[PDB]
Structure 1
Amino acid sequence: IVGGYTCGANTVPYQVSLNSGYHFCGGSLINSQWVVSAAHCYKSGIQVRLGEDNINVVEGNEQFISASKSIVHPSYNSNTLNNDIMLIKLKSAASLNSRVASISLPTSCASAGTQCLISGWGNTKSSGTSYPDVLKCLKAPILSDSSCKSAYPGQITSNMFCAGYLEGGKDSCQGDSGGPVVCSGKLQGIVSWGSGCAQKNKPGVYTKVCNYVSWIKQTIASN
C-alpha cells in the first residue's frame, strides 16, 4: 500500500494473509470456513493466516489454518484478469472473536464517490521496494467508470472498477493482491491489478464483488 497508514493491530479483523512459506497475497474471511481472494493469487499449498498484524512476529492473536480446497472462478482469464476472484475453504473452521471476524457480502454495488478502506502488507514505495511487516491501510473513493476506462482503454470490463486518486500518491501495490476493499461495511472489491503503483492517472483496478454474490453463495453451500 503506497501513501497509506499503519492500521493498528487487528483493526481490520477480516484481513487474511495467504502464506506458502512467505506471505504472497491477502484475502478476506467471509465466514468461519471460507476466504475470498484473487484468482491470480492461486497456488497449491496455501496456509491461511488470520489475526495477523506483524507477519514476521507471532504476537498471540494468529490462527494458521491450511486450505482444504481452492476454487478459481469458472471464467477467470489470466490474460485480461477478468473475473479475478477465487474461494478458499479452510481445513478447520476459524474461531471468530474480536481479532478475527468475517466481512459481509454486498446486497448491491457501491456508487462512484463512496469511500472505501483498502488494506495489505504490500510494497509501500511507488518507485522502489519496501515491504512492511504490519498492516497498512488506505481510504480511497471508488472512481467513475469513465475515468477508469480512459486510464485503461479496452481493458476494463463490467467486472472491474477503479478506486484511488488520479493525481497518484496513494494506491494498492504488489503484495496487496487479493485483499479487501470494504465500503459501507461490505466487501465490494478485491485488489486485482493496476499500472505500477500510485502513478498519476493510473488508479488501481479491483474485482467488482457485487457481480459475484450468487456464485459465491452457491459455491460455498455446495462445497
Structure 2
Amino acid sequence: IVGGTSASAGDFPFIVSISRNGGPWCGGSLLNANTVLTAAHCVSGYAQSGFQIRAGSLSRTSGGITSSLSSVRVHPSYSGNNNDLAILKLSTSIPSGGNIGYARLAASGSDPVAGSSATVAGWGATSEGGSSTPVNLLKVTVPIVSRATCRAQYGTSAITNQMFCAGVSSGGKDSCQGDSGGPIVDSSNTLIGAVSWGNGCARPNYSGVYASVGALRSFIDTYA
C-alpha cells in the first residue's frame, strides 16, 4: 500500500495474509471457516504446498491462526488479467470470534459507483519497486474511477466488465506489489473487489484495477 496508514485491530476482521515459500506474497479475504478469496494470479499453477494463510492478525508474520491449503479453484474464464479471482479451501477451519470474522460480499450484479469511497488494505510494498514490506497491515482510501475513464487510461479492451478501477488522478495512494488478492471494501466495509493489477503503483493517471466481486459472485457462491 502506497500512501496509507496503519490499520487498527478489527478494521478488516476477514483479511488474511498469504505467504509463499515463507515470504510475503498476497492478501485475501476469509469467506467462511474454510474458504479464502484471493486473486487467481496469486495461486494459479503454483505448487499449493508453498502457501500459508494467516488470519486474525495485523501482522503477516506472527499472531492469529494459520492454515495450509487443501485445494485451489480459479475462475473458469481466468485469462490474462481478466477474471482474476480464485477460491482457496483451507486444511484448518478458522472460527469467527474476537478479531476474526467473515466477509460480507457485494450483491450479485453490483458495480461500484464512480466517485464513491473505497478502502484497500494489505502488506505490500509502500513504494513502486520497493523491496521491503511492512510487518503490519496498511490501508488507504481511494475513490472509484469510472470504467470509461479507466479505459481512457489503459485502453478500451483492457478494462472488462469484470474489473473496476480506483485511485486518485494525481496519484500517491494505491495498492502495489504484494497487495494482490487482498480486499477493497466500500464505505460500509462490504467486500467489493480484490487487488488485481495496474501500471506501476500510485502513478498519476493510472488507476489501480480490481477484480469485481459483484461481477463474479456466481463463481464465488458456487464454490464457497
TM-score (norm 1): 0.92
Hey, what does 1:82 align to over in structure 2? 82
Distance of 2:125 and 2:19 partners within structure 1? 16
Distance (whole Å) between structure 1 residues aligned to residue 190 and residue 8 of structure 2: 20
Give yes or no for the alignment of 1:26 onto 2:30: no
Partner residue of 1:67?
Answer: 69
CA distance, structure 2, for counterparts of residue 104 and residue 120 of structure 1: 18
Q: Where does residue 167 of structure 1 map in the other structure? A: 170
How many angstroms apart in 2 are the aligned matches of 1:147 and 1:98?
41
Question: 1:202 corresponds to which residue?
Answer: 206
Question: Between Structure 1 and Structure 2, how many residues are aligned?
Answer: 215
By how many angstroms is 1:145 displaced?
A: 1.1
Does residue 158 of structure 1 match 2:161?
yes
Rounded to whole Å, the distance in 1 between the matches of 2:66 and 2:139 is 22
- In structure 1, the partner of 2:52 is 47
TM-score normalised by structure 2 residue count: 0.91
DSSP 3-state at the match of 1:189 = strand
Residues in 2 aligned to 1:123 and 1:197: alpha-carbon distance in whole angstroms: 9
- C-alpha spacing 1:76/1:182, structure 2 compared with 1 (3 Å): same
Asked if 1:94 corresponds to 2:125, the answer is: no
Q: 2:112·2:164 contact (CA, 8 Å) conserved in 1?
A: no
Describe the SS at the equivalent of 1:210.
helix
Cα pair distance change 1:168/1:71, threshold 3 Å: same
Q: Which residue of 1 aligns with 2:105?
A: 105
Matched position secondary structure for 1:130: coil
Describe the superposition over 1:77-135 as per-residue Cα deviations: whole angstroms up to 9, x where unpaired: 1x3x1000000011122021131111111123321122111000000013644311110
The structure-2 alpha-carbon separation of the partners of 1:129 and 1:151, relative to structure 1 and needing over 3 Å to count, comes to same
1:148 to 147, 150, 155: 150
Aligned-pair CA distance for 1:180 = 0.3
Q: Deviations over 1:166-209 (max 9, x none)?
A: 21110100000000011133211110000010111011000011
Query: 1:18-50, CA deviations, whole angstroms, 9 ceiling, x for partnerless residues?
Result: 122122100001111111000000132222110
In structure 1, what is the Cα distance between the partners aligned to 2:132 and 2:223? Answer: 37
Deviations 1:49-92 (A, max 9, x none): 10121223x34xx1001111110111101x3x100000001112
Query: Structure 2 stretches of 5 or more lacking a match?
Result: none
3-state SS, counterpart of residue 98 of structure 2: coil
The residue aligned with 1:115 is 117
Where does the alignment leave 5 or more consecutive residues of structure 1 unmatched? none
Residues 134-145 of structure 1 correspond to what in structure 2 (within 5 A)? Answer: 134-145=136-147
Cα displacement (A) at 1:165 = 0.6
- Percent identity of equivalent pairs: 42
SS at the partner of 1:83?
coil
| Matched letter for residue 174 of structure 1 | Q
What residue is the counterpart of 2:195 in the other structure? 191
